[PDB]
């Protein structure tokens, strides 16, 4: 079984997203929706266009999603001081809290599930070598 790095990373990413959906279930929020909140939380404010690039998802589906999350009271649209035609989306108090709960709920378990087939010895090597690919 020889399998190229790129494909392995894809497969392991997808599985992580499966588990994300599972562990986010109690809070009625998908992995896709959650990634959005996080990206918005890393900036203070960000535009849909800028948010599309970071997330790498379709602009239209993202715009529908952004609106779902607005109904949920998690995301609000400020008018861009610079653009005055584009909008800066940011998290609400509710959005920031709901986002932080999601982290607290998902985080420990997802890691523990992903790494159930590995020694803490091997887990460290894996983290180390994945770090090497990034810079």
């Amino acid at each position: 079984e020889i399998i190229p790095l790129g494909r392995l990373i894809h497969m392991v990413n997808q599985k992580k997203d499966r588990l994300l959906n599972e562990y986010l279930s109690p809070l009625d929020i998908t992995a896709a929706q959650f990634k959005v909140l996080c990206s918005i939380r890393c900036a203070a404010c960000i535009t849909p266009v800028e948010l599309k690039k970071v997330l790498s998802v379709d602009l239209g589906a993202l715009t529908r999603m952004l609106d779902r999350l607005v109904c949920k009271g998690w995301v609000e649209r400020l008018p861009n001081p610079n653009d005055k035609r584009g909008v800066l989306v940011k998290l609400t108090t509710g959005g920031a809290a709901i986002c932080e709960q999601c982290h607290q709920l998902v985080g420990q378990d997802l890691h523990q599930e992903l790494t159930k087939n590995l020694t803490a010895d091997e887990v460290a090597t894996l983290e180390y070598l994945l770090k090497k690919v990034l810079p």
Copy 2:
């Protein structure tokens, strides 16, 4: 030198992979999304748009448009579903089959080369072995 969790690490390294994929594909005039679609249609010789939406976890709106674009290119043809009659079975043309193979070479080598730039062959081997362990 900070403890970043496996979950976030895999995301960052995946996202980097996706970006490099886009770069190495511009010369061929075909997007990363369009490329993944061709590969999925390739893997399942014949597939429903619905079934394909599921495999790709994308919007059925985006996909149906994307399918239309690829039909224009002549890489994808629609057959009527013998099982349905309300559905279609998309599949690859010889053209689309060729283009998909050609992209898998063109980005096959170089994506790997760029990703493993800072890694010993022994480290790459160790990396692949540990990633595999996560998948069962």
